[PDB]
PDB file of C-alpha atoms in Angstrom:
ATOM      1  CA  UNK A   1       0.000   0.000   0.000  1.00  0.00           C
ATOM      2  CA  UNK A   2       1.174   3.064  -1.030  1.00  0.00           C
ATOM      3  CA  UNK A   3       0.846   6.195   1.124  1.00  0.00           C
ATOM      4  CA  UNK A   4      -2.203   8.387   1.070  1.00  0.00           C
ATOM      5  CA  UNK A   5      -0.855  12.235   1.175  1.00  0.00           C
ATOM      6  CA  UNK A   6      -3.379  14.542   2.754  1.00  0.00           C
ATOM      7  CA  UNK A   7      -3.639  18.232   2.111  1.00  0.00           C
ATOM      8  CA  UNK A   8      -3.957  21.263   4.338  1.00  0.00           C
ATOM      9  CA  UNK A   9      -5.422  24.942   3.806  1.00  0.00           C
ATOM     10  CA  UNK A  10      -2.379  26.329   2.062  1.00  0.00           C
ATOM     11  CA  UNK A  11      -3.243  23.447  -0.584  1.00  0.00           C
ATOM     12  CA  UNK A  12      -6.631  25.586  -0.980  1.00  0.00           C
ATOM     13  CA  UNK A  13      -6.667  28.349  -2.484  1.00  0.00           C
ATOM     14  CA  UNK A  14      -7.392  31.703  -0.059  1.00  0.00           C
ATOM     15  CA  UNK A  15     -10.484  32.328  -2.313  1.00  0.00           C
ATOM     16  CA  UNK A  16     -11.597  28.737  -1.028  1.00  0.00           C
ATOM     17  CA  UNK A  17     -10.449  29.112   2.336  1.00  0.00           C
ATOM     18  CA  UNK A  18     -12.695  32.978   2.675  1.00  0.00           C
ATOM     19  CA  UNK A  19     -15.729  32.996   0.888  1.00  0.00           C
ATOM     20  CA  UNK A  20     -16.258  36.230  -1.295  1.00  0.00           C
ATOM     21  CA  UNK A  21     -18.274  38.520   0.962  1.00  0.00           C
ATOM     22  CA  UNK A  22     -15.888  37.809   3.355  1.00  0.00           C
ATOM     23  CA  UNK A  23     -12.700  38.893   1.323  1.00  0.00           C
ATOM     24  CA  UNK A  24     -14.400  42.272   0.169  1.00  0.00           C
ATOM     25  CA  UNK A  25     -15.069  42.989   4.016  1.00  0.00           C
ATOM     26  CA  UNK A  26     -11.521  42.571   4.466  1.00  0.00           C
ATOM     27  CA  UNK A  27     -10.322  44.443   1.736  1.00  0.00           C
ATOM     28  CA  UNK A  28     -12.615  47.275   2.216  1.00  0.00           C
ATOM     29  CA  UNK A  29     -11.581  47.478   5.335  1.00  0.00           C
ATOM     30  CA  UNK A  30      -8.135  47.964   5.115  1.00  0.00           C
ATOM     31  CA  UNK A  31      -8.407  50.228   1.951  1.00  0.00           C
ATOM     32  CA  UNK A  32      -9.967  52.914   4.869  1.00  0.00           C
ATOM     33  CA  UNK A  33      -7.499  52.297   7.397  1.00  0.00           C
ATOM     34  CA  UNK A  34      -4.133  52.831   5.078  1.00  0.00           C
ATOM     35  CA  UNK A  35      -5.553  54.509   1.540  1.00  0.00           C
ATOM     36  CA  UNK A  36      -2.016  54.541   0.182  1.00  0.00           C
ATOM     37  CA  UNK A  37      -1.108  50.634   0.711  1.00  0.00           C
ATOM     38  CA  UNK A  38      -2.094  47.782  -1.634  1.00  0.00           C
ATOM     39  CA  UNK A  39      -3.707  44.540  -0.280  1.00  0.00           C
ATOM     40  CA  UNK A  40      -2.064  41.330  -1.976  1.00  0.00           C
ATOM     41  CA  UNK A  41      -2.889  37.737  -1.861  1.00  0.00           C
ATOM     42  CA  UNK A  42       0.826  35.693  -2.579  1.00  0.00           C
ATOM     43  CA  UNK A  43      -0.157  31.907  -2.700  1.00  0.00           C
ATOM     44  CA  UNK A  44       2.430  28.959  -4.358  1.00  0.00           C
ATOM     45  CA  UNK A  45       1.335  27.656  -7.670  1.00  0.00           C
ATOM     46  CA  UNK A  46      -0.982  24.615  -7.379  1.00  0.00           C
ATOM     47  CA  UNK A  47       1.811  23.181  -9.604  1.00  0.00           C
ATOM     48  CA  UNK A  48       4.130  23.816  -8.115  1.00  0.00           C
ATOM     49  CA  UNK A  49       5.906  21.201  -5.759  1.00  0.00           C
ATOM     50  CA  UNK A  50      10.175  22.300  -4.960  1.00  0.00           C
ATOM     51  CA  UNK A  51       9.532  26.084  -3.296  1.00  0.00           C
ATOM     52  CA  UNK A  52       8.506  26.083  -0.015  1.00  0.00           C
ATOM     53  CA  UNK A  53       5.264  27.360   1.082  1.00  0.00           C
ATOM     54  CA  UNK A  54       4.950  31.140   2.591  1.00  0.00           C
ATOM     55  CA  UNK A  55       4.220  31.508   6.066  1.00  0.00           C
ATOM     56  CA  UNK A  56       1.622  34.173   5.060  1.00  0.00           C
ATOM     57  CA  UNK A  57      -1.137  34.865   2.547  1.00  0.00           C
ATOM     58  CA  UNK A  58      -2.000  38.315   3.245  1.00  0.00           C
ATOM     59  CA  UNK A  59       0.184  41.256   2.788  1.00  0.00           C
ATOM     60  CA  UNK A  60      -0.028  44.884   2.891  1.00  0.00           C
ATOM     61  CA  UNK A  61       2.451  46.987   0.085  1.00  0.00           C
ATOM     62  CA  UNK A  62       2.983  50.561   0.134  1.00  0.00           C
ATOM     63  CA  UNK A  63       1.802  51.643  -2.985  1.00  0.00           C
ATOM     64  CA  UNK A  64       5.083  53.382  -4.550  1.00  0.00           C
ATOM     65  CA  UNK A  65       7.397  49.958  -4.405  1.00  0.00           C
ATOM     66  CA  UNK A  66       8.195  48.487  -7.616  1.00  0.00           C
ATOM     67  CA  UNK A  67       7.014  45.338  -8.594  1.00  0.00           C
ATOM     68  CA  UNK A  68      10.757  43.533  -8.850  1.00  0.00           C
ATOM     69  CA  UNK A  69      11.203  45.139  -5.724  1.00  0.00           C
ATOM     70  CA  UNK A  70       8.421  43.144  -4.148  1.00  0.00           C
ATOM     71  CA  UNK A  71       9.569  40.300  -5.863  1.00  0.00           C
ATOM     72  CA  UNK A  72      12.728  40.435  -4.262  1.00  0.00           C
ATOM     73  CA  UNK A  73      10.856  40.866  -0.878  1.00  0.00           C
ATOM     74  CA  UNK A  74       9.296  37.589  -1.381  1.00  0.00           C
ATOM     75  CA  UNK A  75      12.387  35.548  -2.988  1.00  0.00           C
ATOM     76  CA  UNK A  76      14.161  36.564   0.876  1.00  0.00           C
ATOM     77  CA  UNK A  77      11.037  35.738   2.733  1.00  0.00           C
ATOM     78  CA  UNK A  78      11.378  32.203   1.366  1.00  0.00           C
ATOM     79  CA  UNK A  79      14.801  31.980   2.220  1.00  0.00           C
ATOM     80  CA  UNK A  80      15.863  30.826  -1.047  1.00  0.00           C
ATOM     81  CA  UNK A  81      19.366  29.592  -2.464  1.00  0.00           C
ATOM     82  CA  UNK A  82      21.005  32.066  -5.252  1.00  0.00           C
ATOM     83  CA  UNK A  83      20.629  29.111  -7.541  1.00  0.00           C
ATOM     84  CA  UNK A  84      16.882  28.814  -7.310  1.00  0.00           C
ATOM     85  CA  UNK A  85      14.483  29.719  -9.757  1.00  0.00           C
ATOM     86  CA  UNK A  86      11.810  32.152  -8.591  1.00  0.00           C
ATOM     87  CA  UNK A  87       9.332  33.932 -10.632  1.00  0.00           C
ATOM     88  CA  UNK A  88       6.272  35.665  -8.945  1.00  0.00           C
ATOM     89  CA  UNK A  89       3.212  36.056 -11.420  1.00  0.00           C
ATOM     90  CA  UNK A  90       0.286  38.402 -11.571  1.00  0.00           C
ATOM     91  CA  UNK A  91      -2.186  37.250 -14.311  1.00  0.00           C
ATOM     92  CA  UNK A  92       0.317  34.957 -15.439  1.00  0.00           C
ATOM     93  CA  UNK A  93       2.924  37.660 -16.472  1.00  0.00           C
ATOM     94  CA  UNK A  94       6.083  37.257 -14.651  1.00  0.00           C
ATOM     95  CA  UNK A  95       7.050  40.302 -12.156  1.00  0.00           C
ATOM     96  CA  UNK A  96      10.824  39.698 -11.836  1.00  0.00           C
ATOM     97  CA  UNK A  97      12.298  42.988 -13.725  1.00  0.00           C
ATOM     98  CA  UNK A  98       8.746  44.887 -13.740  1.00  0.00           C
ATOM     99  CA  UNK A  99       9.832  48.190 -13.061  1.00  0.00           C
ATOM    100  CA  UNK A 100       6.156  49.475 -12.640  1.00  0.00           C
ATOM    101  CA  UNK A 101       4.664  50.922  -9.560  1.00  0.00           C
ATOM    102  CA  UNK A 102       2.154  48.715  -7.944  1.00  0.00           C
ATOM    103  CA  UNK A 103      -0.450  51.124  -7.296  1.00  0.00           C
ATOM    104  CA  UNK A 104      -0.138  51.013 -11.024  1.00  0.00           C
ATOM    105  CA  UNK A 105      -0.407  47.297 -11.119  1.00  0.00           C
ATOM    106  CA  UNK A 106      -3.207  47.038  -8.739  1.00  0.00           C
ATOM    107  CA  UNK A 107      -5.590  49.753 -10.610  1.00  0.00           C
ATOM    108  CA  UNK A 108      -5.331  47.193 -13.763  1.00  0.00           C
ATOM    109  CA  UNK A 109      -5.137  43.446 -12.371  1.00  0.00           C
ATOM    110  CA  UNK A 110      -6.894  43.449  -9.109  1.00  0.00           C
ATOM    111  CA  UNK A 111      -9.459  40.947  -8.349  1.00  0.00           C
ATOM    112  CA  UNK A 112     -13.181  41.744  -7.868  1.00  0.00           C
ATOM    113  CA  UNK A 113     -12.915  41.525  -3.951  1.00  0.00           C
ATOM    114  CA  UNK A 114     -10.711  44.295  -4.163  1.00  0.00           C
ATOM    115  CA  UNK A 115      -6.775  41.940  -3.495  1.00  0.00           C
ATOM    116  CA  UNK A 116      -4.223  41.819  -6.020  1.00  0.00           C
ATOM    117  CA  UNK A 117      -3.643  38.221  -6.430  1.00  0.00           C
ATOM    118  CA  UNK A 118      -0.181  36.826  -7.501  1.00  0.00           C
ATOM    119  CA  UNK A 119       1.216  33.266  -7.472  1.00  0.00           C
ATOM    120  CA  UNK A 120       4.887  31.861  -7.883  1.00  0.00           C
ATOM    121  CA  UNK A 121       6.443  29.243  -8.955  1.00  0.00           C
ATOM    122  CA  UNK A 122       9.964  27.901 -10.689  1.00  0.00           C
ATOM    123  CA  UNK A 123       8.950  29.207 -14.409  1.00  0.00           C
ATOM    124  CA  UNK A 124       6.818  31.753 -15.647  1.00  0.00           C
ATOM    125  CA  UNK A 125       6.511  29.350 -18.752  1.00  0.00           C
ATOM    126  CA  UNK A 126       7.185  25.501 -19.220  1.00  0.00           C
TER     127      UNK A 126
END
């Protein structure tokens, strides 16, 4: 027999783990509170098996950082080896050298509940 591997809530997506309502309520929240900070979902791939997973979900960007600068932030969060692949997607389009602001960002990709949603993984493409 072989083994049986369960899975836990970071192998759900956060819009699975929140219902819809729920996220907007957050978001709209925090939008009030600090107007000039963006509200971002970072979640691993579903494909993706050799990163580790983040120890958070929810994150809160002050809107004039560029987007490779948040992808650095995230490549250090995970600790990773200067040999390992890291790309960090938003609408499938890696982020790595985006030099854009991500107020910028946010105003065209955000989700309807209001988070900017972005996923990584080892390659942008196969």
């Amino acid at each position: 027999d072989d083994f049986e591997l369960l899975d836990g809530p970071s192998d759900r997506p956060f819009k699975q783990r929140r219902s819809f309502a729920d996220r907007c309520k957050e978001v709209q929240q925090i939008r009030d509170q600090h107007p000039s900070k963006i509200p971002v979902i970072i979640e691993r791939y579903k494909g993706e098996k050799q990163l580790p997973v983040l120890d958070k979900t929810k994150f809160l960007v002050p809107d004039h950082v560029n987007m490779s600068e948040l992808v650095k932030i995230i490549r250090r969060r995970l600790q990773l080896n200067p040999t390992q692949a890291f790309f960090l997607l938003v609408n499938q389009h890696s982020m790595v050298s985006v030099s854009t602001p991500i107020a910028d960002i946010y105003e065209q990709e955000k989700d309807e509940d209001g988070f900017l949603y972005m996923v990584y993984a080892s390659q942008e493409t196969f």
